[PDB]
Amino acid sequence: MFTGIVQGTAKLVSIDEKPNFRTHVVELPDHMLDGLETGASVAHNGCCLTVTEINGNHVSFDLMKETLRITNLGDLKVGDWVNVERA
């Protein structure tokens, strides 16, 4: 799915804690928005996540508790930069 050739960084502009998961909103680079549809896989810091929503260059993903515990995505704070790569 992924080459490990990161295409750029994206700022975490938002974290919604909901009852069973977290939504991360990231601001993607313009050159990554082209042809991006909901359901597409983007790896965040190497972790595969599914696009749930697109508002402009603001892209949403839903993170389960297991993803948060196994990876460092549990420790991000708003304003952090994540490596991003579409598949």
Ligand X SMILES: Cc1cc2nc3c(=O)[nH]c(=O)nc-3n(C[C@H](O)[C@H](O)[C@H](O)CO)c2cc1C
C-alpha distances out from residue 85 to 9, 17, 18, 39, 75, Å:
9, 24, 26, 14, 20
Q: Does 47 bind ligand X (CB under 6 A)?
A: yes
Q: Which one among 12, 28, 67, 84 touches ligand X, defined by CB under 6 A?
A: 67
Contacts of 31 (CB under 8 A, 6+ apart): 7, 8
Asked if 72 and 45 touch (Cβ cutoff 8 Å), the reply is: yes
Handedness of CA 27, 32, 38, 39 (dihedral sign): negative
Q: Which stretch binds ligand X (CB under 6 A): 9-17, 23-31, 48-56, 74-82?
A: 48-56
Q: Which stretch binds ligand X (CB under 6 A): 1-9, 12-20, 28-36, 74-82?
A: 1-9
Q: Which one among 28, 61, 76, 84 touches ligand X, defined by CB under 6 A?
A: 61
Binding partner at 61 among a second copy, ligand X, none, C-beta below 5 to 8 Å by kind: ligand X
Residues in the annotated binding site for 2,4-dihydroxypteridine: 4-6, 48-50, 62-67
